[PDB]
Structure formats: structure tokens, C-alpha cells
Design an enzyme around this catalytic site. Structure first.
Site, PDB file in Angstrom:
ATOM      1  N   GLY A  85       0.804  -1.211   0.000  1.00 27.17           N
ATOM      2  CA  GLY A  85       0.000   0.000   0.000  1.00 27.17           C
ATOM      3  C   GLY A  85       0.839   1.263   0.000  1.00 27.17           C
ATOM      4  N   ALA A  86       1.984   1.230   0.681  1.00 28.94           N
ATOM      5  CA  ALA A  86       2.927   2.342   0.741  1.00 28.94           C
ATOM      6  C   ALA A  86       4.142   1.886   1.541  1.00 28.94           C
ATOM      7  CB  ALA A  86       2.317   3.595   1.364  1.00 28.94           C
ATOM      8  N   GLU A 132       7.464   3.659   3.973  1.00 22.52           N
ATOM      9  CA  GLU A 132       7.817   4.868   4.717  1.00 22.52           C
ATOM     10  C   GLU A 132       9.286   5.253   4.596  1.00 22.52           C
ATOM     11  OE1 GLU A 132       6.448   2.124   6.185  1.00 22.52           O
ATOM     12  OE2 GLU A 132       7.853   1.365   7.694  1.00 22.52           O
ATOM     13  N   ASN A 133       9.909   5.096   3.426  1.00 23.46           N
ATOM     14  CA  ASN A 133      11.299   5.512   3.259  1.00 23.46           C
ATOM     15  C   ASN A 133      11.473   6.950   3.732  1.00 23.46           C
ATOM     16  OD1 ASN A 133      11.866   3.009   1.558  1.00 23.46           O
ATOM     17  ND2 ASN A 133      10.448   4.104   0.201  1.00 23.46           N
ATOM     18  N   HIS A 167      -0.940   6.964   8.191  1.00 24.79           N
ATOM     19  CA  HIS A 167      -0.147   5.797   8.562  1.00 24.79           C
ATOM     20  C   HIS A 167       1.325   6.003   8.222  1.00 24.79           C
ATOM     21  CE1 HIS A 167       0.458   1.374   9.130  1.00 24.79           C
ATOM     22  NE2 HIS A 167       1.433   1.606   8.270  1.00 24.79           N
ATOM     23  N   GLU A 168       1.606   6.443   6.993  1.00 25.58           N
ATOM     24  CA  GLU A 168       2.989   6.592   6.550  1.00 25.58           C
ATOM     25  C   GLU A 168       3.691   7.741   7.262  1.00 25.58           C
ATOM     26  OE1 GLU A 168       4.674   4.490   4.524  1.00 25.58           O
ATOM     27  OE2 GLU A 168       2.885   3.281   4.891  1.00 25.58           O
ATOM     28  N   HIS A 196       4.704   6.723  10.691  1.00 22.10           N
ATOM     29  CA  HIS A 196       5.872   5.852  10.637  1.00 22.10           C
ATOM     30  C   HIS A 196       7.181   6.617  10.749  1.00 22.10           C
ATOM     31  CE1 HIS A 196       5.315   1.634  10.423  1.00 22.10           C
ATOM     32  NE2 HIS A 196       4.423   1.675   9.451  1.00 22.10           N
TER      33      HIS A 196
END
Ligand SMILES: COc1ccc(C[C@@H](C(=O)NO)n2cc(CNS(=O)(=O)c3ccc(-c4ccccn4)s3)nn2)cc1
Ligand code: NA
Ligand SMILES: [Zn+2]
Length: 896
Positions: free
Chosen positions: A281-282, A284-285, A317-318, A321
Site C-alpha cells: 500500500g505504501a 515509509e522511506n 499511517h505513513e 511511521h
């Protein structure tokens, strides 16, 4: 013990040695988007803690050509340095650098390596992705995805989350491309041949799995937060108009996360880029968060309100993170929940704080109920369980680590108060910044939190001990407890138990599944007379309480904030049901939702009969609260689809009649527009979808009229987004509409519209049409392979595609393993989405034989047992409750 060139490997443990510690990576990458390959070089600054004759690091599918060792502190390795001998061990995905002379402790050395490889063709490492322009042109970009153990496919490194270090990245590119990475760009130098070289700022201390670098030609919209962070939303050029909301939400959410956590985002820029080919979904870099197009882009013409909610969820969410994950990272993947669980939980806090109009607070209960579905089985696991192999590490990303961790965090907040919980969070984040923590560290920081010698000090130390002791039992034990409550005038007998789905109270293995499990459950309850919430901690297997009031009913677990199920013996359930039917408004809405959920769970558990639950669903005609109404309707709709998946036509037709009749006023008062609130629109979508699924004549006529008008106008007439998926699905029932929808899919520029169109096409009846969709998904040219896992699921749940999807998966297993990894989320979702809905002994035998065939080939997954137990659960639920449902429906027909 061995290697590719013979000889011995100076290491056995699949874990790297703790001797050589990295400090700084110098990573230069030269990707070629025409030959679809890359050459790269690195210089790793290492600290030697003990004398060793070899260094062990990770490397996978990388051809290493040159390897040297230099040193400024050890003169024996002065410039230009000595050559190192390279040994490869693919079994553990490791390489060994043999040094000519023993290294000196407490010194620093520099390991230089030159390597090269092709751009991957899958979803992992440094892989290639393509997108389509408005005119029909196809463009190529290169993107990285490393979590958990795929950074080793791009550059040799100490690829474990504990080996944090700094990163200085340089990317060589053509003039037609731009290069993005974690940190902002410091300088661009022009090369002789006409190429360009981008130098990026040095990264802070961080794990390897967060390194990212992209070469593409995307366009971006930029903005600034209150704290001066430059947020930029990157996407394909023709899709830039779809990024506005993503920027607005990210700005707001970042400001809240800073205020709530009291820690500023440390990087000067934060980039959100929408990757066309993206499996998760994604991701978090740090400073370069990659998204699926459906998780970031928002188009008002084709995106519904639920799409807005999902995009906000994923961005929250990201962004969360960045603290729970990048700033404070876990020690090892066994405590993966330390990152994911917190992020999932922080969704609720952040979204509800910044966008209360989305009303995500009401939706959060589903997050807990989804895990309760899998935690009431024996095949579950504790939130903290060790893992070693890459497949096992990938398996750790399941509903347990995410939702269950989030739910027990919400339970602990309700027990400790928002102020105490927030302070504990802030202390945890500030304490472990730029380092790693484990489960014990979190619970210590959360229990020993200071709000804002004495007896207050002694009670403070006793209560902090209490909290830590409490949560240790919630993280180290599987399952979910069941609270049996027996009333007796003023006495209340409380029993705790391990809740089990499809294993009754007298089953011969039920006592062998009640072994050592005991929970410190923070019970909360309210009464019919006093609205005051009462709190008590159950620490034993059985307990008793007293409330001088003598009231009608007692509702335990207020708002379902606790991770446990309540069961009422005697007249408790009857008192509550009568209360609901008379005046449901006397109970809290979340209490109603919890009651419905718990009632149906206990019906499956054998503590209640199905007619009790079905009699409770009578009051739904008087319910106005959308969450409770949608909960009951979802249970009845699941019953209908469970009957329709089999050949049971009488019960299915009776369920259709009851749903269309008992809920006719609410269905008829629904409009075909996008007006109202978020839950108003979602209620409209669900109700109209339900009505059109049951062949209700008005729904079908209106949907066919809208689709005919849309096709005759050729996109010029507008269909409301909330009804878009319904209209397209109805239109797909004709070969002309089906082909037109497939053509519009190929030509569409909105990923949301494409997702709706793909679902619509999957609701077809012709076997050949569904098979063509599956084959197109496999090919990956028209329908992207990233959608395959979802598409197969949508086909398998329907009667026409159930056998087709199951046959396809059984026949083409080897071809699927070439596109995804074994432990990948896609393979797990394919297996579950094509097998878990089975509810017969024949299909259970077929699935068991298939899983055994997958064994002895080298493929083992925990989802195998989970699917089998779920199919068994379904079989038991049918045999125990099928005639009851029949009788109840017939009784309703006669009751008028
Ligand atoms: C709510 O928005 C979400 C929800 C989840 C994610 C996943 C994402 C992440 O959360 N990173 O922090 N992620 C994990 C991994 C590595 N493991 S994986 O096997 O390949 C795997 C991929 C997807 C999984 C999944 C998806 C849904 C539910 C449970 N699991 S599991 N890579 N990226 C992103 C955004
Ligand atoms: Na993570
Ligand atoms: Zn995550």
C-alpha cells in the site's frame, strides 16, 4: 560451510556478526533506463570491535567485481589499500570478505566495492516500473523497495535493522530524468558525455531498509508546513491535478504529529511519490514515501468518499511511521509490531484529530473485529514471536502485528488516560531516538510515565509495576479472552476463558486448549440505572464483585475499548435484547455494535443459539446509527452470500425476501447522489449495492438507466462516485457494456475509476470473460500484475468464479511464484481469497491435498493452517446452525 567456488565460509549464523559495526555508507548508483541495468560502487566506513580475519555482510543477486580495504587509523591498510577475497554464500544471502591480516580493535576501516546487476522485473529491490501517458506513450522509471530484507539486492550492506548508519547517495542520470532520494539534493554536476550527477545530503542514522532512490520524470506540487518542512507530492505529469488533496492532508497531518509527539520532523523535505507499479500500500522511506496510485491520488470526478478516507488513512499511517519506525526502529523483526502496530493505531488518533468529519473513530472497531476473527482460532500467534528466514520475516506482517497491537494500545490508553498515554509515548520516542528498542523497552517507557517520599510515590510505583505486568501477558500470549458474567441480585460472578471459534464448551479438545492462559483484563462496565463507568482489573481465573443497586442489565466493556468478548448467563442477554427492542437509545452506540458483534461470535462459539442473534436483528428497523445498522446488515448479507455460494436456493431466497422487506423504508429513502456526510454517503453506497445485489427491480432499472445514459453520452454525463461502482457492475452484465468498460479501463487516467471498472468486470457471469480478466492480470500489459491478487479474490467469492479461481491457482502455482515471493502478501492473499470461503468437506479435502502438494517442494506458510481451520470453522457453523436459520426465516414468513 561451503561456497560457490568451493572452500569454507567463515560463518554459519544467518545473522551477521556483531564485530564489524557500520558507520557511514557512500553509495553511488548509475542506472541505465535503456539497457535496464545499473552499475554502482560503495565505500562503507566500519568500526572493528574485535580482531577478525573476515567481514560478513549481505549481498543478493549482485555481481561484485572489485573489493578493497583502506584505513586511516591502521597504517597497514594505508592508501591505496589492499585487495580483499570475496566468498559468496547464497543460502544465507551473505558474502565474506577475507582480509590478508587481522584487523585491530577500536579502529576504523573503509570497505570499497564495485558491483552491477540488472533492474529487477518484480516488486523488490531496485526494480523497473512503467506508466502510460495521456496520449498513449509508455515511460519507464526505476524505484527501490527494501523492507524487510531486499536492500541486499541493490547494494551490499549489513542488511539488518540494528546496523544503523549514515548514507551519502550520488545518482548518475540523463537530462530527461530527475533523481529523488531520502535527503534533499545538494548539488548537480555536469559530466563530459552530457550526463548529470546528483549529490544528496548525508542521511541521519537509520536502518538499511529505509534507503530509497528513484529515477523518473514525474511532476510535483510543493508546499510548506508550519515548521518549514517542504512537502512535495510527486506523480506522473498527466496526473498532477490528482495530487492536491494529498498535499493538503500531508501538511495538516505532519503538523499534528509534530505537536502530538513534541518532536520536530528532522529532515528539511518530505516527498510523497505515487509509483505506478507498487506491491504494498505504501512504504515509509525516510523523506521519500512511495505510494500506490490508489493510496495517494484523489480525483473528485471518480473518487468516492471512502476513497478519500483510505487516502487520508494511508497518508496518516505513513507519516506516523516517520517517528514509529524511522526515528525509533525495532531491534529485530520479532517485535515488528513496535513499528506497524503503533502506526496503525496512530491512524485513529491523527485522522480523528485532523479530519473529524471523516468519522474514522466509528470505523476503528472493524480493525479489532478483523483480528478477533483470526485470534479465536488455535492457529493464531502472539504479537511478539521470533523469526529468522526472510519468508518468516515477511509473514510477521499480518493482522496480528498491525490490528491487535493497535487495539491493545487503544485498550491501554482507555485504562491510563490520554494525558498519561501521550506522555509515555513522548518519553518513548525521545528516549530511543536514532537507535533501536524492543518490547520490554516500550512497556517500561509506557508504564513509567509522568503526568504533568510520599504514599503517592509508593502507589505510583505499584501502579507502574501493575501496568507493565498487565501488558506483558497481552503481548506474550495468543488468543483473546472471553468474560462470562453471571448476575445474582447484587453479586456478579466473573469468569475468564480463552475464546475459541467452533469449539464448544464440552468439546473433547476444548480443555486441552485452556492450558495456561490467563489475562489481566481491565474490565469496564455500566448499568441501566447509573451511567457512571466502573473499572475493575480481573487478575485471576474467577472473581466476584458487588454493586448495591439491583438493576436490570449490566453492559460490560464500554464502547468495546477492551480486547475481550463478554458473555451474559441467565437473563442477561434477554434483558439487553428487550432493552434494545424497546428503547435502543438507552445504550451507547458503540455498545450496540459490540453487542451485535459479540452475540454473533457467541452463536458461533456455542454459547448462544442463532435464533437469539436473529431476534436481536429485529431492532435494526428502529436503528438510526449507521455503524450498528451496517454491522447487522453485513451479518445478514454474509449469511445470504454463504447460502448463495452453495446450492441452497430456498434459504437464500428467503434471506433475500427478508432483507428487501424488513429494510424497505431505509432502502427507498436513499438517493442516487454524493450528498450528505461521509457515513451518509457510505450508507447510501452499501444499501444500494445490497439492493442491486438482490435483483431489486428499482435499483436495477436506475443503474441500467444511468449506465445507458453514460455510454450513449460517451463519458459526457456524470455518474455520482458513491454509485459509480454499482452502475458499472450492472452495466457489465451485457457483452456490449462489458467490452466498453474494458476499453474505458485501458484509456482511463484515474486509478480509482480503474479499480471500480475492474470490479465491475469481475462481476460478470460468463466463464470466458472472468478467465480473460485473470489472464490479462497475469500478462501485466493491460491489467497490472499488482492487481492480480485483488482480482482473483473478487472473482472467487462469487459463485460463477469460485471454481474457476480455485482451478487457476492450483494449475498455475509455479507461474505465480515467478511473479511474487512465497512469503509475499500477494501470494498469501491469493491463497486465502480463493480458499478460505470454502465451506464443504470436499473443498476442505482439495485444499488440504493442495497444501500438502506445496509441502515437500520447499514451500511452507502459516496461512496454510489458518485457511484449513477457517474452512473447518465454516463447516461446523453450517452443520450446527443451518436448520435453525431455515426455521427462523420460515417463522418470520409466518409472523407477519
Ligand atoms: C493502512 O495502510 C497501509 C497498510 C499496510 C501497508 C504495508 C506496508 C507497511 O505497513 N510498511 O510500514 N508494507 C509492509 C512491507 C513489507 N512486508 S510484506 O510482506 O511485503 C507486506 C506488504 C503489505 C502488507 C499488508 C497490507 C495490509 C495489511 C497487512 N499487511 S504486508 N512493505 N510495505 C502499507 C499501508
Ligand atoms: Na515498518
Ligand atoms: Zn506500515
Amino acid at each position: 560451510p561451503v561456497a560457490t567456488n568451493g572452500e569454507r565460509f567463515p560463518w554459519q549464523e544467518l545473522r551477521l556478526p556483531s564485530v564489524v559495526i557500520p558507520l557511514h555508507y557512500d553509495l553511488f548508483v548509475h542506472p541505465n533506463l535503456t539497457s535496464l541495468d545499473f552499475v554502482a560502487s560503495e565505500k562503507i566506513e566500519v568500526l572493528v570491535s574485535n580482531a577478525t580475519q573476515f567481514i560478513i555482510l549481505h549481498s543478493k543477486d549482485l555481481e561484485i567485481t572489485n573489493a578493497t580495504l583502506q584505513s586511516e587509523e591502521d597504517s597497514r591498510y594505508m592508501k591505496p589499500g589492499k585487495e580483499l577475497k570475496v566468498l559468496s554464500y547464497p543460502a544465507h544471502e551473505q558474502i565474506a570478505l577475507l582480509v590478508p591480516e587481522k584487523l585491530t580493535p577500536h579502529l576504523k576501516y573503509y570497505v570499497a566495492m564495485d558491483f552491477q546487476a540488472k533492474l529487477g522485473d518484480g516488486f523488490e529491490g531496485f526494480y523497473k516500473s512503467t506508466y502510460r501517458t495521456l496520449g498513449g506513450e509508455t515511460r519507464i522509471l526505476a524505484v527501490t523497495d527494501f523492507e524487510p530484507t531486499q536492500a541486499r539486492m541493490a547494494f551490499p550492506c549489513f542488511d539488518e535493522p540494528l546496523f544503523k548508519a549514515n548514507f551519502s547517495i550520488k545518482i548518475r542520470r540523463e537530462s530527461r530524468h530527475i533523481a529523488l532520494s531520502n535527503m534533499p539534493k545538494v548539488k548537480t554536476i555536469e559530466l563530459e558525455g552530457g550526463l548529470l550527477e546528483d549529490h544528496f545530503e548525508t542521511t541521519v542514522k537509520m536502518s538499511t531498509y529505509l534507503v530509497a532512490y528513484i529515477v523518473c520524470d514525474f511532476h510535483s506540487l510543493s508546499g510548506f508546513t508550519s515548521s518549514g518542512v517542504k512537502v512535495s507530492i510527486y506523480a506522473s505529469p498527466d496526473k498532477r491535478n490528482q495530487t492536491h488533496y494529498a498535499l493538503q492532508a500531508s501538511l495538516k497531518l505532519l503538523d499534528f504529529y509534530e505537536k502530538y509527539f513534541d518532536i520536530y520532523y528532522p529532515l528539511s523535505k518530505l516527498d510523497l511519490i505515487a509509483i505506478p507499479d507498487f506491491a504494498p500500500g505504501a512504504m515509509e522511506n525516510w523523506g521519500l514515501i512511495t505510494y500506490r496510485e490508489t493510496s495517494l491520488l484523489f480525483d473528485p470526478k471518480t473518487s468516492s468518499a471512502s476513497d478519500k478516507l483510505w487516502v487520508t488513512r494511508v497518508i496518516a499511517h505513513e507519516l506516523a511511521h516517520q517517528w514509529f519506525g524511522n526515528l525509533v526502529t525495532m531491534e529485530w523483526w520479532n517485535d515488528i509490531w513496535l513499528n506497524e502496530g503503533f502506526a496503525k493505531y496512530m491512524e485513529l488518533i491523527a485522522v480523528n484529530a485532523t479530519y473529524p468529519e471523516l468519522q474514522f473513530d466509528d470505523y476503528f472497531l472493524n480493525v479489532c473485529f478483523e483480528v478477533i476473527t483470526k485470534d479465536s482460532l488455535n492457529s493464531s500467534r502472539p504479537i511478539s514471536k521470533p523469526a529468522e528466514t526472510p519468508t518468516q520475516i515477511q509473514e510477521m506482517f499480518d493482522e496480528v502485528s498491525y490490528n491487535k497491537g493497535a487495539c491493545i494500545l487503544n485498550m491501554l490508553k482507555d485504562f491510563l488516560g490520554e494525558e498519561k498515554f501521550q506522555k509515555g509515548i513522548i518519553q518513548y520516542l525521545k528516549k530511543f531516538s536514532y537507535r533501536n528498542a524492543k518490547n520490554d523497552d516500550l512497556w517500561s517507557s509506557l508504564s513509567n510515565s509522568c503526568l504533568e517520599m510520599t504514599s503517592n510515590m509508593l502507589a505510583f510505583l505499584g501502579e507502574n509495576a501493575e501496568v507493565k505486568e498487565m501488558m506483558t501477558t497481552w503481548t506474550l500470549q495468543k488468543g483473546i479472552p472471553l468474560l462470562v458474567v453471571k448476575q445474582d441480585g447484587c453479586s456478579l460472578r466473573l469468569q475468564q476463558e480463552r475464546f475459541l471459534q467452533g469449539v464448544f464448551q464440552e468439546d473433547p479438545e476444548w480443555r486441552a486448549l485452556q492450558e495456561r492462559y490467563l489475562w489481566h483484563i481491565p474490565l469496564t462496565y455500566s448499568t441501566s440505572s447509573s451511567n457512571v463507568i466502573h473499572r475493575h482489573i480481573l487478575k485471576s481465573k474467577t472473581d466476584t464483585l458487588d454493586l448495591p443497586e439491583k438493576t436490570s442489565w449490566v453492559k460490560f466493556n464500554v464502547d468495546s475499548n477492551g480486547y475481550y468478548i463478554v458473555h451474559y448467563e441467565g437473563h442477561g442477554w434477554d434483558q439487553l435484547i428487550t432493552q434494545l427492542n424497546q428503547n435502543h437509545t438507552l445504550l451507547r452506540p458503540k455498545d450496540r455494535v459490540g453487542l451485535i458483534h459479540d452475540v454473533f461470535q457467541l452463536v458461533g462459539a456455542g454459547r448462544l443459539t442463532l435464533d437469539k442473534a436473529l431476534d436481536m436483528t429485529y431492532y435494526l428497523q428502529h436503528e438510526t446509527s449507521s455503524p450498528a445498522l451496517l454491522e447487522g446488515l453485513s451479518y445478514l448479507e454474509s449469511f445470504y452470500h454463504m447460502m448463495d455460494r452453495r446450492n441452497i436456493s430456498d434459504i437464500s431466497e428467503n434471506l433475500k425476501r427478508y432483507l428487501l422487506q424488513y429494510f424497505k423504508p431505509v432502502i427507498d429513502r436513499q438517493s442516487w447522489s454524493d450528498k450528505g456526510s461521509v457515513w451518509d454517503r457510505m450508507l447510501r453506497s452499501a444499501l444500494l449495492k445490497l439492493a442491486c445485489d438482490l435483483n431489486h427491480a428499482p435499483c436495477i432499472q436506475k443503474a441500467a438507466e444511468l449506465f445507458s445514459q453514460w455510454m450513449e453520452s460517451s463519458g459526457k454525463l456524470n455518474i455520482p462516485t458513491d454509485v459509480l461502482k454499482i452502475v458499472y457492475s450492472v452495466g457489465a452484465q451485457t457483452t456490449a457494456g462489458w467490452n466498453y468498460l474494458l476499453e474505458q479501463y485501458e484509456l482511463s487516467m484515474s486509478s480509482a475509476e480503474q479499480n471500480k471498472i475492474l470490479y465491475a468486470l469481475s462481476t460478470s457471469k460468463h466463464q470466458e470473460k472472468l478467465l480473460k480478466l485473470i489472464e490479462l492480470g497475469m500478462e501485466g500489459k493491460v491489467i497490472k500484475t499488482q492487481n492480480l491478487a485483488a482480482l482473483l479474490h473478487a472473482i472467487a467469492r462469487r459463485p460463477k468464479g469460485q471454481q474457476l479461481a480455485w482451478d487457476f491457482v492450483r494449475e498455475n502455482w509455479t507461474h505465480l511464484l515467478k511473479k511474487f515471493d512465497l512469503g509475499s502478501y500477494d501470494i498469501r492473499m491469493i491463497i486465502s481469497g480463493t480458499t478460505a470461503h470454502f465451506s464443504s468437506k470436499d473443498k476442505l479435502q482439495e485444499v488440504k491435498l493442495f497444501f500438502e502438494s506445496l509441502e515437500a517442494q520447499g514451500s511452507h506458510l502459516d496461512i496454510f493452517q489458518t485457511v484449513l481451520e477457517t474452512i473447518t470453522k465454516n463447516i461446523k457453523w453450517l452443520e450446527k446452525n443451518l436448520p435453525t436459520l431455515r426455521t427462523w426465516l420460515m417463522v418470520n414468513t409466518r409472523h407477519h
